[PDB]
Amino acid sequence: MKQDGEEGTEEDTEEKCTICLSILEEGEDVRRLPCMHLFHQVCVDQRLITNKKCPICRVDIEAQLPSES
Ligand SMILES: [Zn+2]
Ligand SMILES: [Zn+2]
């Protein structure tokens, strides 16, 4: 009949959690690191608990803390 061969378009590092390997699109808490990288607020505070440096940007992601332990 019977297409359309159809995309958004625009789908590059826009709203995509590369931690939990899934796209977001609507209402999600996003957080962007100081090293310019946007991720999901939950998963960034999962993978980057024990690590705190952009693997390419070479900037510390914890940018002050200011916790303890
Ligand atoms: Zn996620
Ligand atoms: Zn970065």
UniProtKB/Swiss-Prot annotation:
Zinc finger (RING-type): 17-58
Binding residues for Zn(2+): 17, 20, 40, 43
Tissues and organs where the protein is expressed, per its UniProt entry: Broadly expressed.
Domain notes: The SUMO interaction motifs (SIMs) mediates the binding to polysumoylated substrate. The RING-type zinc finger mediates the E3 ubiquitin-protein ligase activity and binds directly to free ubiquitin. Non-covalent ubiquitin-binding stabilizes the ubiquitin-conjugating enzyme E2 (donor ubiquitin) in the 'closed' conformation and stimulates ubiquitin transfer.
Quaternary structure, from the entry: Monomer. Interacts with SMAD6, SMAD7, AXIN1, AXIN2 and SKIL isoform SNON. Interacts with (phosphorylated) SMAD2 and SMAD3. Part of a complex containing RNF111, AXIN1 and SMAD7. Interacts (via SIM domains) with SUMO1 and SUMO2.
Described function: E3 ubiquitin-protein ligase. Required for mesoderm patterning during embryonic development. Acts as an enhancer of the transcriptional responses of the SMAD2/SMAD3 effectors, which are activated downstream of BMP. Acts by mediating ubiquitination and degradation of SMAD inhibitors such as SMAD7, inducing their proteasomal degradation and thereby enhancing the transcriptional activity of TGF-beta and BMP.
Record's protein name: E3 ubiquitin-protein ligase Arkadia
Chain's gene name: RNF111
Section covered of the full-length record: 927 to 994 of 994
